[PDB]
Amino acid sequence: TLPPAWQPFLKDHRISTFKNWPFLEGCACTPERMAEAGFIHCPTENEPDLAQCFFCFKELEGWEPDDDPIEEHKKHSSGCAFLSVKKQFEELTLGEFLKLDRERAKNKIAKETNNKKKEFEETAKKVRRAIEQLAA
């Protein structure tokens, strides 16, 4: 029993998120291997194979069966501190663990901030356009 907020730090939780993952035996990006790389399954209607790092919150869609989830994570989010983490979860000290969760909370805020910027820029685009049309 770890609080649900920290469950994502556990690999077996992360694996359990891959409810209807298409890539299974034979494939490089299995649930086991995605989870070893830090991903969770966040499917949608529109993006059914959508997966997200739990730590740096990077979202990657477009998965092909030969993809090595680790090498994809390095490529798309090289900054991620979870990739630095050599030791198994249980071999971590509590200091080290708390350090990490503080970094995750930072990443989360950064991510939330980055989304807001995008929504705003998107709304601005519309407003511009509506005014251009009314100038005509």
């Binding site: 993006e47 869609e61 477009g62």
Partner: peptide, 5 residues
Amino acid sequence: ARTKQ
């Protein structure tokens, strides 16, 4: 794979 677009 690629970034959510």
